[PDB]
Amino acid sequence: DGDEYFIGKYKEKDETLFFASYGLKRDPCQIVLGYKCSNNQTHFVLNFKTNKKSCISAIKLTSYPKINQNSDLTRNLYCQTGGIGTDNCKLVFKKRKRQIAANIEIYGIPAKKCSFKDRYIGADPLHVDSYGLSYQFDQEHGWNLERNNIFKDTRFSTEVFYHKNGLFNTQITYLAEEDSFSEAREITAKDIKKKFSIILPNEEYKRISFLDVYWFQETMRKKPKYPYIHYNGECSNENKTCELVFDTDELMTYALVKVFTNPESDGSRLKEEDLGR
Amino acid sequence: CRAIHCPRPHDFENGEYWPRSPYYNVSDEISFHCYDGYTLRGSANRTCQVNGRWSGQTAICDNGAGYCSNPGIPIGTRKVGSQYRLEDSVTYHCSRGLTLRGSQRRTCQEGGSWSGTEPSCQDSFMYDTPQEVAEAFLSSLTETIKRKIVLDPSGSMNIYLVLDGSDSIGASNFTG
Ligand SMILES: *[C@@H]1O[C@H](CO)[C@@H](O[C@@H]2O[C@H](CO)[C@@H](O[C@@H]3O[C@H](CO)[C@@H](O)[C@H](O)[C@@H]3O)[C@H](O)[C@H]2NC(C)=O)[C@H](O)[C@H]1NC(C)=O
Ligand SMILES: *[C@@H]1O[C@H](CO)[C@@H](O)[C@H](O)[C@H]1NC(C)=O
């Protein structure tokens, strides 16, 4: 059977960039199609850089033989310089003592008119998020809980950072029963800087009550450095156009924001033990 | 008692070495260099010292079109076999007056590595000095990280020491 690792999401109308099979004990590799690798006792890295005009969509790796360890609580595949949307990134994989083969495939789509909003937004945005796990609330306060069966990390107290299939997450605030879905906004790779911002409307019945961000990025080492996504000034009733400002320590390659709307929100909603320094 | 002669190379495939002589004295040099479109791994300049062994590693010129890589010809031996795909075998043997030390047949395993050790046949008068013996024993017995021994959970080791007391030394009662 063998274990599998994913990056991104697959679609039924994508062509293959390349497809190969590798042994995991030879030294050095076999140079396939003039590419470069590196193999050690506990690391396997690959360099990729396409020539045609295309943007990458998904990556998948399969390993044999099966080993007794789950594949969702830690990180095993990650690429260090690039990502999803940029035409190249340098894959890194961490082995064990009992893995002796690998199969690798890459899919992509034409560069000019390629956007990923049609997949990660789902078909029922009000009930299921991009991960697939459905929302579930508390009946006495109407605030969503924290999903617990995924790789989650914290920087300091009162912070959360989930990870799954190369996709991160960060929830700005708490969510109520009677919220509605307004729209979604996407940011491609040609409008990404070390620091930038985005404008959203707050006119009458388009009051912002919930924001959750999904983004890919790069990591120099296995320990990531999550960027600072703070909320510029204060978005109260008076100031109609509200801005969201990013502050990154490493360069991203894609972002997605799912605005939620609720006319009843007063602008402040916080837990009874989150509040004091 | 006569002078010490370092062994003369027997075969070399896809390459050329300078210079050539019927026998090599102490502190003589050999340089390897191989054809166009290949790649050389190892040491390009090799010299033999008073011990009787060439200094460095084995020089291997490879192309890069096989499931498992080229094993190479150790200096002094001869190789039979030229198939480098899955489930093939390669055999070694060296010249007259030399006795082999290592694997006789090597087989390309599933992962991509050979099965055995690289042979290098010795003669009567080469001994091993304590430094290399200690280094090899430590490197084989433990693993690196410093150097620590690795065991599986609920694991254990059993050491069995076997000596002999036949009439070879006769030194008191196993002294030393
Ligand atoms: C086996 O190879 C892998 C890579 O194929 C090695 O991992 C990489 O090792 C390099 C060299 O130490 C690391 O680069 C170093 O990073 C520091 C961070 O500040 C920087 O100052 C330099 O760029 C320095 O060269 C690299 O981070 C590391 N990891 C990667 C590339 O993901 C691995 O160490 C090798 N195995 C052994 C036993 O050395
Ligand atoms: C809130 O209004 C103030 C008024 O000066 C403005 O400076 C600020 O940018 C506004 N904040 C947002 C998030 O719109």
From Swiss-Prot, chain A:
It comes from the Eukaryota. It is found in: Secreted. GO terms for molecular function: toxin activity. Keywords: Blood coagulation cascade inhibiting toxin, Complement system impairing toxin, Disulfide bond, Glycoprotein, Hemostasis impairing toxin, Secreted, Signal, Toxin. Glycans are attached at residue 239. Disulfide bonds join 29-37, 55-114, 79-89, 235-242. Its main location: secreted. Expressed in salivary glands. One of its GO terms (cellular component) is extracellular region. Sand fly salivary protein with antithrombotic, and anti-complement (alternative pathway) activities. Is a slow, tight, non-competitive, and reversible inhibitor of factor Xa (FXa, F10). Is specific for FXa (Kd=3.86 nM) and does not interact with non-activated FX, or all other enzymes tested. In addition, it blocks prothrombinase and increases both prothrombin time and activated partial thromboplastin time. It also prevents protease-activated receptor 2 (F2RL1, PAR2) activation by FXa. In vivo, it abrogates edema formation triggered by injection of FXa in the paw of mice. Interacts with factor Xa. Associates with complement proconvertase C3b-B complex. This is Lufaxin. It comes from Lutzomyia longipalpis.
From Swiss-Prot, chain B:
Involved in proliferation and differentiation of preactivated B-lymphocytes, rapid spreading of peripheral blood monocytes, stimulation of lymphocyte blastogenesis and lysis of erythrocytes. Residues 4-63, 66-123 form the Sushi domain. This is Complement factor B Ba. The chain holds residues 98 to 288 of 764 of the full protein. Mn(2+) binds at residues 166, 168. The record marks 147-148 as: Cleavage. Disulfide bonds join 6-48, 34-61, 68-108, 94-121. Mg(2+) binds at residues 166, 168. Changing residue 174 to L: In AHUS4; gain-of-function mutation that results in enhanced formation of the C3bBb. Glycans are attached at residues 25, 45, 173.
